Amino acid sequence: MKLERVTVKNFRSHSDTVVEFKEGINLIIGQNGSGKSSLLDAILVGLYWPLRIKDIKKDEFTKVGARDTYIDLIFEKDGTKYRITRRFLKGYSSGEIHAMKRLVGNEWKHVTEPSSKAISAFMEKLIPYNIFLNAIYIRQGQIDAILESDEAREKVVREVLNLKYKALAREAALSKIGELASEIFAEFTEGKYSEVVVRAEENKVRLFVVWEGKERPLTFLSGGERIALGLAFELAMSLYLAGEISLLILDEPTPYLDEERRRKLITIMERYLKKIPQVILVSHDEELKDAADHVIRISLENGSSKVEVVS
Ligand SMILES: Nc1ncnc2c1ncn2[C@@H]1O[C@H](COP(=O)(O)OP(=O)(O)O)[C@@H](O)[C@H]1O
Ligand code: BEF
Numbered sequence: 001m002k003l004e005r006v007t008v009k010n011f012r013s014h015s016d017t018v019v020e021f022k023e024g025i026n027l028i029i030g031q032n033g034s035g036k037s038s039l040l041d042a043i044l045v046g047l048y049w050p051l052r053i054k055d056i057k058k059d060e061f062t063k064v065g066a067r068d069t070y071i072d073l074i075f076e077k078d079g080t081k082y083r084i085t086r087r088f089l090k091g092y093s094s095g096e097i098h099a100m101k102r103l104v105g106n107e108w109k110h111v112t113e114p115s116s117k118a119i120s121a122f123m124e125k126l127i128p129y130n131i132f133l134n135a136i137y138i139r140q141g142q143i144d145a146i147l148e149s150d151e152a153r154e155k156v157v158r159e160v161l162n163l164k165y166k167a168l169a170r171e172a173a174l175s176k177i178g179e180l181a182s183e184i185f186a187e188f189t190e191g192k193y194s195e196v197v198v199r200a201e202e203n204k205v206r207l208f209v210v211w212e213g214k215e216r217p218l219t220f221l222s223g224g225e226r227i228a229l230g231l232a233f234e235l236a237m238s239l240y241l242a243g244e245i246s247l248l249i250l251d252e253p254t255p256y257l258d259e260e261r262r263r264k265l266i267t268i269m270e271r272y273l274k275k276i277p278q279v280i281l282v283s284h285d286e287e288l289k290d291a292a293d294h295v296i297r298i299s300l301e302n303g304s305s306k307v308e309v310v311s
């Protein structure tokens with residue numbers, strides 16, 4: 001999967017924004033409240049509307065002072081270019097239109113009936129929503145979501161790997177993710193933790209950290225460490241699936257991280273994020289600029305986001 005273009009009109013702080021995304025690490029940098037997460041959440045809305053996420057509401061996200069919201073996304077999947085266009089009219093919903101086209105030769109052609117339901121039906125077959133929310137797009141505040149429970153983790157894993165012996169394949173997959181996560185987390189914590197153990201056990205995927213030679217529960221970690229671990233696991237997952245999904249969208253990776261950890265993050269960008277064909281990384285941390293392949297600066301001007309292509 002590859003994101004080419006996002007166009008947003010009257011979505012939260014964005015009055016009129018166009019962002020071109022490219023291969024490699026695409027860093028979107030800007031201060032608190034400038035419009036970074038609004039762009040990512042516009043991508044989510046663009047792909048999967050109707051959503052049932054409590055903090056994203058049609059009547060809230062229309063930019064104050066405007067009536068019409070417009071989201072347009074161009075992306076590639078499995079060699080085919082796709083375009084989804086959504087127009088929202090606040091307070092109303094019948095006069096609003098949703099279309100999904102594909103590039104067939106030169107002409108763009110509707111892939112289905114231009115309706116939320118049919119598009120959702122197609123999108124779920126193209127890229128399942130759970131894979132997007134759990135494996136592709138890590139929303140702000142959700143870095144540690146994968147540390148939540150053995151069951152939820154089993155659910156995401158099972159969904160992510162899809163369909164001798166299924167169990168052997170599962171063990172091998174989890175083993176590889178565990179290897180990768182261990183390498184990353186050990187780099188992140190300077191050998192404080194020598195392994196991240198990801199283990200299948202009944203309808204559950206256990207997750208432990210090794211400290212002084214023994215497996216420990218996740219409560220063992222400090223807050224910053226849980227951030228590091230979440231990053232490590234999601235990166236391991238993205239790398240394991242690098243050939244299949246090839247995209248990682250990560251909002252603010254720096255919460256609770258001290259100075260050294262923030263420096264290690266750069267090393268991790270350099271060593272690992274560069275192995276994922278496309279990454280969209282959002283942060284207020286300027287230190288992250290040098291390790292990125294493409295930098296987009298966002299700021300708030302007179303009530304509206306302004307986007308500036310740096311590189
Ligand atoms: N409906 C709206 N109309 C105009 N501005 C909005 C609306 N909803 C939210 N905002 C503004 O959008 C700003 C950017 O939010 P966000 O993109 O979440 O910031 P960040 O760059 O920190 O992710 C907020 O600080 C808020 O003032
Ligand atoms: F306040 Be933002 F998410 F940088």
Ligand SMILES: [Mg+2]
Binds near residue numbers: 036037038140251252
């Ligand atoms: Mg944000």
